[PDB]
């Protein structure tokens, strides 16, 4: 249970930035939206919903060695890299993603959902 006090709120449905608002969060959902208990001071910030990236591949990253590591590395090493990838993605403001390829992301999604590692909400495609 935390109350959020922020100076401006962006209304996604309308596409307009409103004024001061107070957001009350209990049980992980939004309960009240008073316009005009733990408290977080965001009165010098703009309120937005979390962003969704609909096309990512959290199981790897492009590099000059990307076309030779496949024959020498295992998916476990790629999972160890994906831990940092997912943390960096979450900390940039993206609370959900849609993964469109790769067989490490269904496992990363399970690990994130169980709380073992930090990351966004993953919708995984598995093998293309």
Please identify, among the stretches 29-37, 54-62, 67-75, 101-109, the one whose residues bind its own copies according to the rule CB under 8 A: 67-75
What string of H, E and C letters represents the secondary structure of the chain? Answer: CEEEEEEEEEECCCCEECCCEEEEEECCEEEEEEECCEEEEEEEEEECCCEEEEEECCCCCCCCCCCCHHHCCCHHHHHHHHHHHHHHHHHCCEEEEEECCCCCHHHHHHHHHCCCCCCCEEEECCCC
Please identify, among the stretches 49-57, 65-73, 74-82, 120-128, the one whose residues bind its own copies according to the rule CB under 8 A: 65-73
Determine if residue 21 is labeled as part of a ligand binding site.
Answer: no
Binding mask 14-53 for its own copies (x = CB under 8 A): ----------------------------------------
Residue 71 binds its own copies (CB under 8 A): yes
Determine if residue 57 is labeled as part of a ligand binding site.
Answer: yes
Residues at the binding site for Zn(2+) are 55, 57
């Amino acid at each position: 249970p935390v109350a959020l006090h922020c100076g401006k709120l962006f209304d996604a449905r309308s596409g307009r930035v409103l004024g001061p608002h107070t957001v009350v969060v209990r049980d992980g959902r939004i309960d009240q939206l008073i316009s005009g208990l733990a408290a977080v001071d965001l009165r010098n910030r703009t309120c937005l919903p979390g962003w969704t990236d609909l096309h990512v591949h959290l199981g790897g990253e492009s590099s000059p060695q990307s076309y030779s590591e496949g024959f020498r590395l295992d998916p476990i090493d790629f999972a160890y890299r994906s831990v940092g990838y997912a943390e960096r993605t979450l900390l940039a403001g993206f609370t959900s993603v849609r993964d469109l390829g790769g067989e490490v992301s269904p496992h990363l999604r399970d690990a994130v959902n169980q709380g073992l590692v930090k990351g966004p909400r993953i919708f995984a495609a598995g093998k293309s």
